[PDB]
């Protein structure tokens, strides 16, 4: 009986800890996935804006090439 009593309380401890654990891991995983996704969304936005700058340089380059001719 005494051994079973010990087995019950240490099972309660084990389950409380496993809950805390999985909660901690679930959260850290979520906050990391969100961080990577938001940065990728911003990175793509700038990537498109920087291609507008490159395009603008080609426009001004094309004008300079048309001028003297």
């Amino acid at each position: 009986k005494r051994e079973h009593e010990r087995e019950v309380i240490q099972k309660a401890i084990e389950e409380n800890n496993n809950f805390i654990k999985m909660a901690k891991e679930k959260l850290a995983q979520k906050m990391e996935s969100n961080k990577e996704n938001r940065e990728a969304h911003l990175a793509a936005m700038l990537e498109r804006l920087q291609e507008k700058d490159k395009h603008a340089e080609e426009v001004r380059k094309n004008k300079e090439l048309k001028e003297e001719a």
Partner: protein, 430 residues
Amino acid sequence: MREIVHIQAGQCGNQIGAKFWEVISDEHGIDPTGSYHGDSDLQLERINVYYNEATGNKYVPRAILVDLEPGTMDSVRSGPFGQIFRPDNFVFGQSGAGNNWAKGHYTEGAELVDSVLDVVRKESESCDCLQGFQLTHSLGGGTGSGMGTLLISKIREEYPDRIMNTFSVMPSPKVSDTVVEPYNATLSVHQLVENTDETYCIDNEALYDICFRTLKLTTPTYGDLNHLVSATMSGVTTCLRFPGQLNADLRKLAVNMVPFPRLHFFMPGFAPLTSRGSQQYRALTVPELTQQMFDSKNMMAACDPRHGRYLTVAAIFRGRMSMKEVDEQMLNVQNKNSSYFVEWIPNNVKTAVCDIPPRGLKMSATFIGNSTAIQELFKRISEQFTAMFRRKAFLHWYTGEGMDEMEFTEAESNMNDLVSEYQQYQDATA
């Protein structure tokens, strides 16, 4: 000088436990300060059974007060007979048990139980010849039920050759605090069947019905319920507290009342039924006591004795009366209803008489019956249990404390075995 160590666990346990000590302290002429002021030597002849002597001839209850919260125990210390208790015997936690058997038996109570066993040991060591232990508790809560049965199991480990006795209050929806009471009760009974020698089944269903139907109390309080309990407890311990031939100690009682080890759940009865402050003026005649003590309406367990058979009976008459008339009336009951007493246990009804009556009465009679009809009580609890357990309702409160559903299944099965064992001897013939 055969000592009994008293333990009261939980709200219910300490509430009735306190009332118990109030009543018998008055019967033994002991005042709230522990000083004797009686007018009879019969009051002190067996005072050592429940009391310890100190210097100045102070009488101290051999009582240990246990709870997982300080609520009720603070009320006891501030009660009328609060001072009488040994201050160091107040053993309490702070967390409470939340009506959860698992909390009392496996987690919260496990943390406190060793402290209690230290006080038990200090009391037991002082004993000239310890008889055993009596516990007061409810089976519907968490502390008295869960931790109470934990204490019983531990006490049996340290004192396996001593008698374990309990006053166990059974839960009822008529006075229910919680819906998980059938769980706590089923788990507790499982413990009591294994680890007690004598259990007085005090059914809150019965106490309520008595208060309502008989005493005409429209709105019964716990005080009205405990007036009935304290009166019953005083009665069943009369043979232990005063000089007598019959059932004078816990073991001899067990040998007389318990034909089979598992069937030790007693159905108590009391007469006359009174309410507090009623103060009735006409004493009952010995015939009146005898008819009422055996009446179903006077049973403290909601079971019809006519639905079963009596294995054993103990009757205790208190007050100045004709021992001749008592014997005649007791013989009259058995001979007029011989069918309700098992024929394969000859002369299974034993009677005692004590000259000292309980306060407020000239005449009174206490009944203790080991009837197979007690199965009705366990059936009732089993029905309430299965109704929830078939859907695993409210189990999360218990699994959260480490318990497995198997432990519930085992507890249920053992109680259903107890019920069938009672039915076995209810049909048995010679």
